[PDB]
Amino acid sequence: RIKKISIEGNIAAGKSTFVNILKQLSEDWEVVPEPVARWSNLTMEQKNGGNVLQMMYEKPERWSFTFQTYACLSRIRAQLASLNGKLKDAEKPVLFFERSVYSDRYIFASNLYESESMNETEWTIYQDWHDWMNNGQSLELDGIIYLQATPETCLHRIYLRGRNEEQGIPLEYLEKLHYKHESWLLHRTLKTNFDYLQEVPILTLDVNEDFKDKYESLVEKVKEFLSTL
Amino acid sequence: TRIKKISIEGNIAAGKSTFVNILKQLSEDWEVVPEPVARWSNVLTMEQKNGGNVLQMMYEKPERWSFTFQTYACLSRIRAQLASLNGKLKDAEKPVLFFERSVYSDRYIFASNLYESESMNETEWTIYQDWHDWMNNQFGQSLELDGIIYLQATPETCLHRIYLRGRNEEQGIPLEYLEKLHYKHESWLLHRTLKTNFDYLQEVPILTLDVNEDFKDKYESLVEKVKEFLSTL
Ligand SMILES: COc1ccc(-c2nc(CSc3nc(N)cc(N)n3)c(C)s2)cc1OCCF
Numbered sequence: 001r002i003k004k005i006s007i008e009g010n011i012a013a014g015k016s017t018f019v020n021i022l023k024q025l026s027e028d029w030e031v032v033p034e035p036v037a038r039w040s041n042l043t044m045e046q047k048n049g050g051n052v053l054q055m056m057y058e059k060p061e062r063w064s065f066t067f068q069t070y071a072c073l074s075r076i077r078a079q080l081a082s083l084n085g086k087l088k089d090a091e092k093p094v095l096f097f098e099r100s101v102y103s104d105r106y107i108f109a110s111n112l113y114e115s116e117s118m119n120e121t122e123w124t125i126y127q128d129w130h131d132w133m134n135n136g137q138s139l140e141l142d143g144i145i146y147l148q149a150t151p152e153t154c155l156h157r158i159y160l161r162g163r164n165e166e167q168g169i170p171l172e173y174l175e176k177l178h179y180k181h182e183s184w185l186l187h188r189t190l191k192t193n194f195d196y197l198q199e200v201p202i203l204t205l206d207v208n209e210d211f212k213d214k215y216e217s218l219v220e221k222v223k224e225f226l227s228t229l
Numbered sequence: 230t231r232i233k234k235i236s237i238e239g240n241i242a243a244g245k246s247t248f249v250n251i252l253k254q255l256s257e258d259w260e261v262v263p264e265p266v267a268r269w270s271n272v273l274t275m276e277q278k279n280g281g282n283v284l285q286m287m288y289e290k291p292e293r294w295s296f297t298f299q300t301y302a303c304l305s306r307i308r309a310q311l312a313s314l315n316g317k318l319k320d321a322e323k324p325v326l327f328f329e330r331s332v333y334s335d336r337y338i339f340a341s342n343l344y345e346s347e348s349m350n351e352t353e354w355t356i357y358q359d360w361h362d363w364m365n366n367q368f369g370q371s372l373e374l375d376g377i378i379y380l381q382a383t384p385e386t387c388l389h390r391i392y393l394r395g396r397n398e399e400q401g402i403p404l405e406y407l408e409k410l411h412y413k414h415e416s417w418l419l420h421r422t423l424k425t426n427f428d429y430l431q432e433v434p435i436l437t438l439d440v441n442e443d444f445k446d447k448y449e450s451l452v453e454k455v456k457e458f459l460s461t462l
């Protein structure tokens with residue numbers, strides 16, 4: 001009975017921030033972090049995650065396939081966990097996901113292939129591994145929230161977070177990611193392998209303005225979104 | 230399930246394919262699941278296409294391709310093993326599904342030997358193990374074995390059998406590598422020293438057949454042991 005809502009957005013758009021605000025607004029609202037976020041910070045996954053992250057930074061064209069498969073698994077099992085042992089005693093439970101299996105593939109893994117960091121064989125193996133691994137069924141989303149921010153807004157926010165590894169993210173890379181989110185979540189010109197996705201409710205939220213201490217209007221839009229469902 | 234699931238294990242060219250095509254024929258209650266990679270070796274579905282490619286890339290550059298190939302081959306197995314388990318033997322009196330090797334073969338024979346050969350690094354191998362644990366648990370519950378049939382031959386006989394099997398892409402296979410795979414088969418199925426992370430495997434009944442002698446024309450005794458073995462499961 002738990003509603004599934006994905007929080008989607010570019011690097012630095014404000015997802016963790018938005019999700020961390022949402023968790024604290026209700027005992028019926030819970031939050032599944034992106035494992036790449038937990039990696040971007042020992043469990044076996046955390047060691048594995050860290051090593052593959054740096055490996056991928058150092059040579060994306062060697063390690064993209066490995067990164068992507070482990071990113072996605074780590075995400076499916078973290079979502080399935082939270083779904084299985086959370087919120088059973090909520091009247092209105094909603095699980096918010098920081099990104100989804102659909103970002104993993106149609107944004108990130110697609111972008112890496114489009115940049116030849118995966119060859120055709122790695123990409124095809126990846127989509128097949130995804131089309132099947134996701135059959136993970138109980139993960140169909142009830143809605144998607146798009147946190148929209150210009151490619152430029154993101155780059156400055158990369159400055160505000162200020163992690164050393166992020167300062168060399170090219171505005172060029174954000175921009176490609178941005179067109180992917182827009183075509184998927186705004187234009188809706190993306191034809192995926194998951195029937196329901198062409199018709200799932202999307203809520204588009206302009207986060208170009210700082211919302212850390214001025215989030216009421218955004219949370220209000222989410223509450224209304226949730227009512228429609 | 231009501232289906233009896235039995236994996237046939239053994240070294241390369243031990244004669245598993247031979248024996249499996251013999252068993253499928255003998256009883257309407259018997260079905261086989263042939264190995265994905267064994268399929269790829271010859272010669273076009275999506276899987277076959279990826280299959281042929283990653284197998285060729287594997288052979289050229291194993292330090293680069295061992296992780297990717299191992300993931301695909303085990304995914305491909307789990308898929309096909311499900312397909313038979315939910316498809317065939319639906320009206321059979323005493324159903325038997327013979328798996329040509331198992332998810333355990335993937336992990337404890339081939340993936341393992343590649344980590345040991347330095348064809349997968351530590352991170353590759355622990356990510357692989359992580360997934361294998363999880364992939365078989367989320368997806369591979371109904372795949373659990375009722376028994377294993379170990380076709381046990383020596384590397385020399387197997388080497389002998391590759392040279393005779395006239396497959397040029399395989400004429401390169403060296404002996405010490407066959408020794409390495411044999412050694413891991415002995416440790417898993419004969420002595421049962423090899424630890425797996427699969428508790429129930431410790432206790433699965435195991436029939437070992439010495440298959441050094443040729444059996445193509447003359448396999449009746451082997452089958453009688455199988456049928457004897459089956460009657461205890
Ligand atoms: C120097 O070249 C690169 C170096 C690093 C990267 C990285 N991309 C990402 C995002 S990929 C990704 N996939 C996911 N499935 C999830 C998620 N949060 N992020 C990193 C974490 S590191 C990407 C790079 O270029 C990719 C070529 F387009």
Ligand SMILES: COc1ccc(-c2nc(CSc3nc(N)cc(N)n3)c(C)s2)cc1OCCF
Pocket residue numbers: 011040041053054057163165166167168169170173
């Ligand atoms: C097109 O070239 C690039 C494309 C993407 C990237 C990315 N780098 C990163 C940083 S990897 C990282 N490692 C960490 N250990 C921590 C952390 N926050 N981020 C992304 C998330 S995306 C970096 C790229 O170039 C890096 C060289 F400046």
Ligand SMILES: COc1ccc(-c2nc(CSc3nc(N)cc(N)n3)c(C)s2)cc1OCCF
Pocket residue numbers: 241269270271284285288396398399401402403406
């Ligand atoms: C470390 O040296 C080797 C280790 C293993 C092998 C193997 N080659 C093969 C043949 S791979 C293959 N590819 C195909 N595309 C078709 C087919 N029937 N077989 C194995 C099954 S194992 C071959 C090796 O040497 C080849 C290069 F000297």
Ligand SMILES: COc1ccc(-c2nc(CSc3nc(N)cc(N)n3)c(C)s2)cc1OCCF
Pocket residue numbers: 264266267287288289291299302303334335336339340343346348
């Ligand atoms: C040139 O060096 C090599 C060439 C080929 C190989 C191969 N090993 C194998 C066995 S991997 C495997 N994994 C499975 N899960 C199943 C199965 N039947 N085979 C091939 C099919 S090709 C291995 C090689 O060396 C590996 C490091 F010694």
Ligand SMILES: O=c1ccn([C@@H]2O[C@H](COP(=O)(O)OP(=O)(O)O)[C@@H](O)[C@H]2O)c(=O)[nH]1
Pocket residue numbers: 009010011012013014015016017018157158159160161162209210211212
């Ligand atoms: O309303 C906001 C949203 C984000 N940020 C900052 O922008 C950077 C990226 O935020 P976050 O980690 O939430 O982005 P994500 O990668 O999670 O989308 C961080 O320094 C935040 O503190 C901010 O100052 N105000």
Ligand SMILES: O=c1ccn([C@@H]2O[C@H](COP(=O)(O)OP(=O)(O)O)[C@@H](O)[C@H]2O)c(=O)[nH]1
Pocket residue numbers: 239240241242243244245246247248390391393394440442443444445
């Ligand atoms: O007792 C046997 C079993 C098999 N073979 C032959 O040796 C090759 C290897 O056997 P198989 O393909 O069954 O080996 P697998 O790799 O499946 O274990 C085949 O061409 C068989 O014709 C043989 O000569 N004697």
